């Protein structure tokens with residue numbers, strides 16, 4: 348196949364890209380590497396890291412650049428400049444939350460999980476609840492009736508946070524409904540069921 | 556008057572945006588706020604954070620989204636899909652280095668500065684030295700002859716690292732020369748010399 352996505356055998360940074368491809372029914376090689384095999388191939392990647400998307404003869408690293416490239420190719424980058432900017436801004440906010448999440452996961456899970464759930468996460472989710480409402484009253488997708496790459500990133504971030512704290516979206520009905528809407532899309536429903544059956548690790552250290 | 560960039564009175568995340576605006580002769584209000592004034596206006600921003608670009612009636616937060624929007628608007632976004640993807644990838648790499656840099660600056664300057672300079676920074680710069688060479692043999696700008704938004708980000712990242720370690724580019728001829736080339740652009744030369752004579756801090760904690 349012409350698309351190949353190389354990453355570790357976890358959800359991590361690649362999962363929104365996987366979700367984009369699965370939902371759009373773009374067939375790809377999901378190339379999942381063992382942690383010990385990475386050293387021998389790391390020099391092949393431009394910053395020594397994954398994920399990497401091979402798109403025909405093009406080798407593209409950096410998850411955000413991969414997503415935006417696919418978005419342009421498949422018309423999921425908004426319909427005008429303002430929409431393009433908005434989904435970019437939204438998606439960058441999602442990345443900020445993921446940074447806070449991964450710092451807690453990898454550096455301080457045993458002591459910072461509880462405080463993160465109680466004192467950090469609610470205020471961060473509230474920013475998205477308010478933002479999501481700006482188009483289509485937040486009752487469909489980030490841009491309203493048309494899907495964009497930012498929807499896959501937000502879906503994943505809400506999903507991993509619900510694993511972490513099953514009740515984190517209780518006070519956020521728009522985010523809760525958005526999450527379920529995205530999970531109900533036929534190709535994602537099937538994919539997420541298989542992902543759960545295999546208990547795919549969210550992170551590289553087994554914590555979630 | 557049609558642009559206002561609101562950020563703290565440091566270089567930080569805003570500086571590549573300032574550099575883009577100045578060098579492209581885009582007039583803007585450089586709205587540099589005091590740290591104690593931010594608490595009172597925090598809720599006006601979509602993620603409670605700066606920088607913010609007011610572009611006419613549009614309010615755009617997230618430094619990467621801001622710079623990508625300006626690049627589209629002023630045709631500094633590459634001339635085809637591969638170029639646009641490439642500069643995105645390159646610029647995201649620059650941001651990754653900045654994350655390493657700021658973590659050290661804000662969380663462990665006294666214990667981690669020397670190990671950063673000796674044992675992290677050189678391998679990170681080597682990645683950029685190799686990558687720079689893929690277009691124009693890396694002997695002009697990131698895309699070869701045409702400037703792009705990524706050039707401003709690479710320039711600022713190289714400059715702040717040269718403040719940290721004056722000798723860091725000695726053994727990277729392409730990056731060294733790129734830095735020389737960018738600093739000699741007349742609008743940047745004027746702006747940067749005024750900034751540095753005014754002792755504008757790189758970071759918010761007085762370390763650099």
Ligand SMILES: CCCCCCSC[C@H](NC(=O)CC[C@H]([NH3+])C(=O)O)C(=O)NCC(=O)O
Nearest residue numbers: 355359360395396397398409410411551651
């Ligand atoms: C234990 C595996 C799980 C770690 C989770 C972090 S994502 C993997 C990490 N890659 C990155 O940090 C990529 C960051 C880049 N900014 C992006 O968004 O793609 C990597 O290749 N790191 C491997 C390495 O540097 O050796």
Ligand SMILES: CCCCCCSC[C@H](NC(=O)CC[C@H]([NH3+])C(=O)O)C(=O)NCC(=O)O
Nearest residue numbers: 443563567568603604605606617618619759
């Ligand atoms: C305090 C001076 C030093 C600031 C250095 C960090 S940048 C300022 C910080 N903003 C961000 O971290 C924005 C990150 C965002 N991902 C972006 O790229 O714009 C902020 O508004 N923080 C203020 C806050 O959260 O209250």
